[PDB]
Each structure stands twice: as structure tokens, then as C-alpha cells.
């Protein structure tokens, strides 16, 4: 999950 988010980034 943490990464599907902070692909924002
Ligand atoms: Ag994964
Ligand atoms: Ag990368």
C-alpha cells in the first residue's frame, strides 16, 4: 500500500 501511494513521489 505504502508504495501505491508514494509513487507520487
Ligand atoms: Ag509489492
Ligand atoms: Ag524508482
Do not use: N, P, Y
Amino acid at each position: 500500500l505504502a508504495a501505491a501511494l508514494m509513487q507520487a513521489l
